[PDB]
Short mmCIF file of C-alpha atoms and ligand atoms in Angstrom, two decimals:
data_model
loop_
_atom_site.label_atom_id
_atom_site.label_comp_id
_atom_site.label_asym_id
_atom_site.label_seq_id
_atom_site.Cartn_x
_atom_site.Cartn_y
_atom_site.Cartn_z
CA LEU X 3 -0.39 1.88 33.16
CA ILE X 4 -3.14 3.85 33.31
CA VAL X 5 -4.81 5.63 30.59
CA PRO X 6 -4.26 9.08 30.10
CA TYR X 7 -0.69 9.33 31.45
CA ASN X 8 1.49 11.45 32.01
CA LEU X 9 5.05 10.74 31.47
CA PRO X 10 7.29 13.78 33.05
CA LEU X 11 10.63 14.72 31.50
CA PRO X 12 12.56 16.97 33.59
CA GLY X 13 13.94 19.78 33.00
CA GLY X 14 12.59 19.38 29.13
CA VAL X 15 14.06 17.48 26.39
CA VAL X 16 17.77 17.40 24.71
CA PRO X 17 19.21 16.12 21.46
CA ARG X 18 20.12 12.15 21.82
CA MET X 19 16.67 11.38 24.83
CA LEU X 20 15.24 8.13 23.45
CA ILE X 21 11.78 7.68 24.52
CA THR X 22 10.19 4.30 24.23
CA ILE X 23 6.51 3.62 24.55
CA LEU X 24 5.26 0.02 24.62
CA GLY X 25 1.29 -0.83 24.14
CA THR X 26 -1.52 -2.67 22.59
CA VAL X 27 -3.94 -1.09 20.78
CA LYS X 28 -7.45 -2.34 21.50
CA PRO X 29 -9.80 -3.53 19.15
CA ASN X 30 -11.83 -1.55 17.40
CA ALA X 31 -9.79 1.60 18.16
CA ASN X 32 -10.73 4.99 16.53
CA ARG X 33 -7.35 6.65 17.59
CA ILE X 34 -3.67 7.09 19.47
CA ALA X 35 -2.06 10.27 20.60
CA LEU X 36 0.93 11.12 21.72
CA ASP X 37 1.10 15.41 23.15
CA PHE X 38 4.92 16.76 24.03
CA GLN X 39 3.82 19.60 26.18
CA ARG X 40 5.53 23.26 26.91
CA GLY X 41 2.47 24.27 29.34
CA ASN X 42 -0.65 24.81 27.65
CA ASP X 43 0.78 24.78 24.12
CA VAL X 44 1.50 21.22 22.07
CA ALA X 45 4.59 21.69 20.72
CA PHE X 46 4.28 17.93 18.87
CA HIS X 47 0.95 16.16 18.45
CA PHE X 48 1.09 13.05 16.68
CA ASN X 49 -2.28 11.16 16.57
CA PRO X 50 -2.90 8.44 14.33
CA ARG X 51 -6.00 8.16 13.07
CA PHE X 52 -7.93 4.88 12.22
CA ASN X 53 -10.95 5.99 10.45
CA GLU X 54 -10.72 9.58 8.84
CA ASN X 55 -13.10 8.84 6.41
CA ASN X 56 -12.47 5.61 5.49
CA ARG X 57 -9.07 6.27 5.81
CA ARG X 58 -5.98 5.13 8.28
CA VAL X 59 -3.57 8.62 8.42
CA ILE X 60 -1.21 9.95 10.84
CA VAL X 61 -1.48 13.35 11.87
CA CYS X 62 0.77 15.86 13.08
CA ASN X 63 0.81 19.43 14.20
CA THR X 64 1.59 21.85 16.83
CA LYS X 65 -1.02 24.10 19.50
CA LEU X 66 0.31 27.34 20.04
CA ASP X 67 -1.97 29.83 22.46
CA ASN X 68 -4.99 27.30 21.76
CA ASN X 69 -4.66 27.33 18.05
CA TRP X 70 -3.49 24.39 16.03
CA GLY X 71 -1.02 24.95 12.86
CA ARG X 72 -0.28 23.37 9.62
CA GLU X 73 -0.92 19.58 9.42
CA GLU X 74 1.80 17.23 8.53
CA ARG X 75 -0.26 14.14 7.60
CA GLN X 76 1.67 10.45 6.82
CA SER X 77 -0.39 8.30 4.63
CA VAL X 78 2.12 4.83 5.85
CA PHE X 79 0.06 3.69 9.22
CA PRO X 80 2.13 0.89 10.99
CA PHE X 81 -0.29 0.17 13.93
CA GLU X 82 -3.09 -2.30 13.81
CA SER X 83 -5.89 -2.75 16.29
CA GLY X 84 -5.47 -5.49 18.15
CA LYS X 85 -1.76 -5.97 18.20
CA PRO X 86 1.16 -5.03 20.22
CA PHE X 87 3.25 -1.62 19.23
CA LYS X 88 6.58 -0.02 20.26
CA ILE X 89 6.44 3.64 19.69
CA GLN X 90 10.03 5.28 19.79
CA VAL X 91 10.73 8.60 19.45
CA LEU X 92 14.48 9.83 19.24
CA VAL X 93 15.09 14.09 19.68
CA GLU X 94 17.50 15.31 17.15
CA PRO X 95 18.78 18.45 16.91
CA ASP X 96 16.37 19.54 14.24
CA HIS X 97 13.29 17.36 14.35
CA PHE X 98 11.31 14.62 16.44
CA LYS X 99 12.22 10.82 14.74
CA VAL X 100 9.79 8.27 15.32
CA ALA X 101 10.08 4.72 14.71
CA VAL X 102 7.69 2.38 15.28
CA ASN X 103 7.84 -1.45 15.50
CA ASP X 104 11.97 -0.92 14.69
CA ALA X 105 11.09 1.19 11.22
CA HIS X 106 11.29 4.61 10.39
CA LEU X 107 8.72 6.21 10.13
CA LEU X 108 8.67 9.85 9.74
CA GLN X 109 10.54 13.52 11.36
CA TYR X 110 8.62 16.53 12.21
CA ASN X 111 10.53 19.83 12.47
CA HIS X 112 10.58 21.80 15.39
CA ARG X 113 8.30 24.49 15.51
CA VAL X 114 8.68 25.24 19.29
CA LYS X 115 12.80 26.45 19.64
CA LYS X 116 12.40 25.86 23.79
CA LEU X 117 13.15 22.01 23.82
CA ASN X 118 13.87 22.97 27.41
CA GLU X 119 10.43 23.97 27.98
CA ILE X 120 9.28 20.79 26.75
CA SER X 121 8.62 19.05 29.78
CA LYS X 122 5.58 16.70 30.06
CA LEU X 123 4.44 14.33 27.16
CA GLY X 124 0.47 13.14 27.60
CA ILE X 125 -0.23 9.60 26.16
CA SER X 126 -3.82 8.87 25.19
CA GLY X 127 -6.43 7.38 23.20
CA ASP X 128 -7.81 3.53 22.52
CA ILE X 129 -4.39 1.45 23.63
CA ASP X 130 -3.46 -0.59 26.69
CA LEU X 131 -0.17 1.02 27.60
CA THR X 132 2.36 -1.14 28.81
CA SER X 133 5.13 0.59 29.53
CA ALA X 134 6.84 4.78 28.67
CA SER X 135 10.14 5.33 29.17
CA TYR X 136 13.49 7.38 28.66
CA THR X 137 16.86 7.32 28.14
CA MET X 138 19.66 9.10 27.22
CA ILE X 139 21.99 6.86 23.73
C1 LIG M 201 -7.87 20.51 13.99
O1 LIG M 201 -8.13 20.16 15.53
C2 LIG M 201 -8.20 18.41 14.58
O2 LIG M 201 -6.77 18.02 14.67
C3 LIG M 201 -6.16 18.58 15.10
C4 LIG M 201 -4.47 17.97 14.98
O3 LIG M 201 -4.55 19.08 13.53
C5 LIG M 201 -6.05 17.75 16.66
O4 LIG M 201 -6.02 16.65 16.13
C6 LIG M 201 -7.16 17.60 17.52
O5 LIG M 201 -7.38 16.81 18.36
C7 LIG M 201 -7.65 17.05 19.66
C8 LIG M 201 -7.89 16.52 20.88
C9 LIG M 201 -8.88 15.25 19.95
C10 LIG M 201 -9.46 14.31 21.17
C11 LIG M 201 -10.20 13.73 21.28
C12 LIG M 201 -10.71 12.76 22.07
C13 LIG M 201 -10.84 13.00 23.32
C14 LIG M 201 -9.40 13.78 23.44
C15 LIG M 201 -9.12 14.73 22.84
O6 LIG M 201 -8.09 15.95 22.54
C16 LIG M 201 -7.46 16.13 22.14
O7 LIG M 201 -6.90 17.37 22.14
C17 LIG M 201 -8.26 17.62 16.34
O8 LIG M 201 -9.37 17.69 16.79
C18 LIG M 201 -10.91 17.09 16.70
C19 LIG M 201 -12.19 16.83 16.62
O9 LIG M 201 -10.57 15.60 16.92
CL1 LIG M 202 9.48 28.24 21.38
#
């Protein structure tokens, strides 16, 4: 698939929706980003950074009216340059739940509450993207 890739989420997200992204991190990658969007707002930005001051960190945040909010940072970093990955995002009633390579990684409490209006997922960064799909569990 071509990156950046836009995956429509028809009628928005709902609890029990599972999104699966398969790809390979490029050698010498700098960043990956998943952006769940509500129009111009970003309800959930998930942003692995491979070199922030010589550390690897995952930054999560929300953008409202063009302004970024308070960051939530995770130091557990399961991505590896050059290697294949699987990201699964499970929508639960109170948070997005993220697993990488079948291991739980983090939860992100819903700040944007109109879940039915979060109707696009943007996938970008230094990856080769193999597939991006959703199903209901
Ligand atoms: C406060 O802004 C930083 O932190 C934000 C999260 O709190 C975003 O990750 C944002 O990134 C959004 C962003 C970065 C980007 C980088 C390359 C290409 C396209 C990009 O599109 C973006 O929205 C960051 O901004 C910078 C300089 O990386
Ligand atoms: Cl809202």
